[PDB]
Amino acid sequence: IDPFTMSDLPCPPTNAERLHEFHRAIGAATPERPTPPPPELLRLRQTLLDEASAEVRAEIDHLLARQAAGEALSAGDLAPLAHELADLLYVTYGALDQLGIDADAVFAEVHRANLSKASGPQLKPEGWRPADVRGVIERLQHAP
Amino acid sequence: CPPTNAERLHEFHRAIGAATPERPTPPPPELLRLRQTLLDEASAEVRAEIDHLLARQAAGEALSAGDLAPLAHELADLLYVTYGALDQLGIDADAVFAEVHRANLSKASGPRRADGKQLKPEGWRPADVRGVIERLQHA
Ligand SMILES: O=c1ccn([C@H]2C[C@H](O)[C@@H](COP(=O)(O)NP(=O)(O)OP(=O)(O)O)O2)c(=O)[nH]1
Ligand SMILES: [Mg+2]
């Protein structure tokens, strides 16, 4: 911005960018570029991923058990599961951010391949190319 | 503004002809069971790849950034099926995630666990995801 800027409205931060803000706030490693992790970092990410996936499973189970007894679930009844699913997003993004890997760039490539694959007969369309996550990591290593 | 990863899942489901509801919608049992299996397989792939990398480190290998591509791929696949579950429930993942994120920033003054996990300071208050769901259902 400069003296010519009369309005400066940014696009909302992405969920991946939010993880960077969180790790900066708590003093956790959050490298700009792909960075081989110490084993202690890998162990933590594993622990948080296990913790979060167990909580998601417990809420899905609770919903199935209630549903079975003639409780027909309501929308508000989805709130704990939604919270746990968001926590699982949070620690999945969190692992990518601590690896210095732009999760949006990797996701975009996975989405490109998946969305392209949906144009096939699920079978692949002609000329389909799978997600090249290795290429994304390489290009992230050379970014501005 | 470019689309979000949650909005990408909405586009994906519309593209495979399995268009998903716009507002929170209680699911049939088989949908919960399907989404759970997808989460379990994706989580197991991530779990296995982290164990794989740790064993290489225990052998003395110095990992490179390129060595991280399979893990990054599996983590992104886990994002895909996690966002996918929220989308099939009709729940805006970004609205829920913003509420969870705000309640995680408020932990910054808390202590850390020995393994590095951020713990909660005195008086911390949880995210109110019930309120986000009510916001999404109405209006
Ligand atoms: O180091 C951390 C700690 C927490 N988090 C995030 C992940 C998730 O969104 C949320 C989980 O925090 P807790 O493990 O403390 N679970 P919860 O808040 O549900 O505690 P409890 O079940 O005991 O009420 O905080 C991180 O990302 N990194
Ligand atoms: Mg909990």
Transcribe A38-100 into DSSP letters.
PHHHHHHHHHHHHHHHHHHHHHHHHHHHHHHTTPPP-SGGGHHHHHHHHHHHHHHHHHHHHTT
Per the CB < 8 Å rule, is B129 touching A36? no
Among the listed residues A93, A98, A87, the one whose alpha carbon sits nearest the alpha carbon of residue A42: A98
This structure was determined by: X-ray
**Is residue A18 within 8 Å of B97, Cβ to Cβ?**
yes
Ligand positioned closest to the Cα atom of A23:
1
- Output the CA B119–ligand 1 centroid distance in Å: 8
Among the listed residues B44, B46, B130, the one whose alpha carbon sits nearest the alpha carbon of residue B95: B130
Per the CB < 8 Å rule, is B47 touching A46? yes
Burial of A27 (0-12, 13-18, 19+ CB in 10 A): exposed
- Residue whose Cα lies nearest atom 26 of ligand 1: it is A91
Distance CA(A49)–CA(A47), nearest Å, equals 5
**Is residue B29 within 8 Å of A67, Cβ to Cβ?**
yes
Per the CB < 8 Å rule, is B69 touching A134? yes
Which of B99, B100, B117 for a ligand 1 pocket mutation test, highest count of atoms within 8 Å of Cβ?
Answer: B117
Distance CA(B2)–CA(A137), nearest Å, equals 21
Distance CA(B117)–CA(A55), nearest Å, equals 17
Distance CA(A92)–CA(A96), nearest Å, equals 7
Distance CA(B113)–CA(B45), nearest Å, equals 26
Helical H runs in B16-92? 29-58, 69-88
- Token couple for B122: 């005195």
Which of A43, A90, A96 for a ligand 1 pocket mutation test, highest count of atoms within 8 Å of Cβ?
Answer: A90
Q: Where are the domains of chain A?
A: 1-144
Distance CA(A69)–CA(B103), nearest Å, equals 34
**Is residue A81 within 8 Å of A59, Cβ to Cβ?**
yes
The CATH number assigned to the domain with range A1-144 reads 1.10.3420.10
First-residue to last-residue Cα distance in chain B:
23
**Secondary structure (3-state) at A107:** helix
- Output the CA A61–ligand 1 centroid distance in Å: 20
Minimal Cα–Cα distance from A7 to chain B, Å? Answer: 16
Domain B1-139 fold: putative ntp pyrophosphohydrolase like fold (1.10.3420)
Ligand positioned closest to the Cα atom of A94:
1
Q: Which of A18, A72, A96 sits opposite B75 (nearest CB)?
A: A96
Question: What are the Cα distances from residue B1, in Å, to A11, A13, A14, A69, B86?
Answer: 6, 10, 11, 45, 22
Per the CB < 8 Å rule, is B93 touching A106? no
**Secondary structure (3-state) at B89:** coil
Residue to test with chain B: of A85, A97, A110, most B Cβ within 10 A: A85
Instruction: Give the distance, in angstroms, between the CA of residue B65 and the centroid of all CA atoms in the same chain.
Output: 23
